[PDB]
Design an enzyme around this catalytic site. Structure first.
Site, mmCIF file in Angstrom:
data_model
loop_
_atom_site.group_PDB
_atom_site.id
_atom_site.type_symbol
_atom_site.label_atom_id
_atom_site.label_comp_id
_atom_site.label_asym_id
_atom_site.label_seq_id
_atom_site.Cartn_x
_atom_site.Cartn_y
_atom_site.Cartn_z
ATOM 1 N N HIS D 188 0.817 -1.208 0.000
ATOM 2 C CA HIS D 188 0.000 0.000 0.000
ATOM 3 C C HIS D 188 0.852 1.260 0.000
ATOM 4 N N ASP D 192 -2.050 1.005 -4.796
ATOM 5 C CA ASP D 192 -3.307 1.186 -4.079
ATOM 6 C C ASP D 192 -4.319 0.178 -4.602
#
EC number: 2.3.1.12
Lengths: 233, 233, 233, 215
Positions: D188, D192
């Site tokens: 992350h 994303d």
């Protein structure tokens, strides 16, 4: 003593000159060809009709119709008929259709004079004319010279397609084959009956004519072949 | 006073230069052509599929697929794509596919840059690109120059087959017609239904390419046309 | 540092010389082509018959029949087989049929010696001969040189038609494709069964051969293909 | 272990998994192989790799490297592969597979497997790869968690396709199609969720019609 015989043949100024001119024609002109076919069946029946009236004097041939459509095709698109002058180009509004006649002596190029004006009672006796005085060799070379373009049909013997010769300064010339029945699928189901599509081959020099345009000459040309009545008004 | 009118037209450096280069191209290159056809029906349905997803942004054309298969065809057989350097030959591993665009001004040769890498979201907007800036004349000549080979489709008007022009030092270039349904006898008896075979014509110079090899380019090429999925992994 | 790789390949005197001769051949010879097809089905069954007897020693190929008809076709019309001597022409009564063999090394032109005299027990082992010593490179170039004409079949891979090379002073040479079943409408109604027509393409130089004549060579040629028994007496 | 450890501590590994029907793609394997048996044999994983490359070509955000202070976004796509060997894990790196055709990537994977089985491949050709791919499903594992290696943002792990029920408008026939388990990993701090998830969206869209890779 052995074999290996062959023949040294003296050549005639006809062949010789035609060869000297056609040679530099080739070297100068990047010859390319365009060929298509169109159904003359309705046009053939127009031959049996126009001849069912006109048998009284003269007989008609199909090639004359192709020539007629060739003229008017240039009338609507003059870009098709042109001559290469080198420094400039010769675009001919006056249409004179040369014809390639098959004779034992050799190739003959009888020139038609403004055939686009002539009717059904003229062009026939004119072609038969140039064939008359041509078979006897009475026609002078100048009437075989200066023609804007020419037309030749060798298909009488059944050649599918082929390559022909043009002569300078003639941009384009057409060569025709023999119409052979080909399969066109129909909405009528069981009947597939094939119609004879007359092979039509045209030549062009890219230094003068361009593909799309001449191709258009064959497009509206063949469109005339569909309904030759398009020539009337 | 009589007739005989014609037009002396000043020629543009575009035509003039293209003619000077294509001439020596001819004299130098013994142009010969190879033509075949392949069924795009499944590929057309792939056009309705890829376009049923991709309508959201851009539209796709069939020619792009032929170009794609042309690239990979060279990737598997580099002997197809080469340039004639005289004393030596130029064999290009980098594949840049030129395209022949039909415009009122004249012939245009937008060059594609490494299309073989590009996907379904790229080559389309790239061809539409070169067409965009090409229609306005914004594309510079250098992006019309230096291309390894080119491709041209004049069949949009229905020409069965034809002869095209290459430009040096470009060994081979392809010219495509319009797909016309032809009869393929089937094991299904009554149904004869004809599939459209897109005319594909390629040119080669025997001083560079040889017949069997390029013919192979069309063999595995058309093999790609059967199942374009052959391009994926 | 970037890409753009290619290959500078040293050329062999084979390629180089063949190119220097074929070039001036082109510039000198206005190459044009003539192509047709003929049904070998009965001739193929003649292959299964002549081979059902002759399997005991050697195997036969179809091309040998086409070559045989080519010879006799010249015997009946010597105008087909001739050589261009410039100032005069070389018309060869002795018929020696060259053949174009496909080998990894390159093009090979094994010359047949007076094949028209040879029977069914000779020409086969002669072609297989020149192929034998040709595959090993044992055949000397002079036996690849001096041939009146040649013949080449690239259709083994399925090429519909194509353009080939001749070599001076050889007027005409034939190039053959692969026979593909085509629809011939029959008086038998329901059965449309298609027969394989072997593509036969011939080349001629208009400075030597003329269209109608060579076209006749293919006319009586194909007439021989209909009934090869026409070669017997 | 020393590298994968600091990888973990540094990278909050999370995974994304989905399945796609290869049935038409398997028949494409019997077709492409009915022509190509003449030389080499093809495997299904190569197609998944191909779609992975082009998936990055259309969305470069998927393929990236974490440089710390900045991020490394790789336009050049080199697909590493996880090979199962008695010695251990091997990461043969593919060089620009997205350009390669049906006659290349196969002999390239079989290549790296050849020189890899003998240990001839040098570690550097196992190092520097943008990402990797691993299929352990050959033994039937439904799904699972894999390892990535820094600075590789995402890597995919595949299972075995198992026929699952898809209700059809054809009523009586329920016939199940095999959906090949496809599991992808992302960091992350780099990738994303929505984006990589898109990588699998247009990816699987390619799996539906691999012809989408042609032009």
């Amino acid at each position: 003593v052995p074999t290996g015989v062959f023949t040294d043949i003296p050549i005639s100024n006809i062949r010789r000159v035609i060869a000297q001119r056609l040679m530099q024609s080739k070297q100068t002109i990047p010859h390319y060809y365009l060929s298509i076919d169109v159904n003359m069946g309705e046009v053939l029946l127009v031959r049996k009709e126009l001849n069912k009236i006109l048998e009284g004097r003269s007989k008609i041939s199909v090639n004359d119709f192709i020539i007629k459509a060739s003229a008017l095709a240039c009338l609507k698109v003059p870009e098709a008929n042109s001559s290469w002058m080198d420094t400039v180009i010769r675009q001919n509004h006056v249409v004179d259709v040369s014809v390639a006649v098959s004779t034992p002596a050799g190739l003959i190029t009888p020139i038609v004079f403004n055939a686009h004006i002539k009717g059904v009672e003229t062009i026939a006796n004119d072609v038969v004319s140039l064939a008359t005085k041509a078979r006897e060799g009475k026609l002078q070379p100048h009437e075989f010279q200066g023609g804007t373009f020419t037309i030749s049909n060798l298909g009488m013997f059944g050649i599918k397609n082929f390559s022909a010769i043009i002569n300078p300064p003639q941009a384009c010339i057409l060569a025709i084959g023999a119409s052979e029945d080909k399969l066109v699928p129909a909405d009528n189901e069981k009947g597939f009956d094939v119609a004879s599509m007359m092979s039509v081959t045209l030549s062009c020099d890219h230094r003068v004519v361009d593909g799309a345009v001449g191709a258009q000459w064959l497009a509206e040309f063949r469109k005339y072949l569909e309904k030759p009545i398009t020539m009337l008004l």
